[PDB]
């Protein structure tokens, strides 16, 4: 329904895709319905924790990130639909912090890791099963276009490589009408 503000809570799992690991964290959305079908959502999560490895070296590094995302949405159906799927599009902001190499990587002549903040596009496919006037069950799949820079020191020498990451976010949540 229009003018409605609700909040979902549940699991948010991020899978890098462009060797980096996956991590599942608490995910909160704060959606506001503009019309009966247009919504404006904000994704927010607890900081993720990804282990980083490559080929022979293995888990050499570890980075944390926060990927808030702002989305314009379209909910299919009408205001009396208990099953409303939705598609979303909008920008992502990703910030990295507590980058640190481990014992394995620090013996490889590796120091000072820092990924630069990234902005990019984000796509969205979700589904709201509305249980009643207040409760709902939700699934959403996110595709974000992430472009950071990897800065590190190889044996004291500055390294600087740009990557594309394009991770998938899978949220299984449960919302409430506020």
Author numbering: 35 to 52, 65 to 224
How does the study describe this entry?
From a clinical perspective, OMPs are important in modulating the diffusion of antibiotics into the bacterial cell, where mutations or reduced expression of the OMPs enhance antibiotic resistance. It has also been shown that OMPs participate in F-like plasmid conjugation, a form of horizontal gene transfer where plasmids are transferred from donor to recipient bacteria in a contact-dependent manner. We have recently shown that the efficient conjugation of the multidrug-resistant R100-1 plasmid into both Escherichia coli (EC) and Klebsiella pneumoniae (KP) relies on the formation of mating-pair stabilization via interaction between the R100-1-encoded OM protein TraNα in the donor and the OMP OmpWEC or OmpWKP in the recipient. In addition to its role in conjugation, OmpW contributes to virulence as the upregulation of OmpWEC increases resistance to host immune defence.
The structure of OmpWKP was solved by molecular replace­ment using the AlphaFold-predicted model. Continuous electron density could be observed for most of the structure except for Gly41–Phe52, which were omitted from model building. The extracellular region is formed from the extended β-strands of the barrel and a single α-helical turn (α1) connecting β5 and β6. A hydrophobic gate is present midway through the channel consisting of residues Leu89 and Trp188, as in OmpWEC, where the extracellular entrance to the channel is lined with hydrophobic residues. The extracellular loop 1 that connects β1 and β2 is missing in both the OmpWKP and the OmpWEC structures, suggesting a highly flexible structure. In the OmpWEC structure an LDAO molecule is bound at the extracellular region but loop 1 is not fully resolved, suggesting that the inherited flexibility cannot be stabilized upon its binding. This highly mobile structural element on the extracellular loop is likely to shield the hydrophobic face of the extracellular region and it could transiently open to recruit hydrophobic substrates.
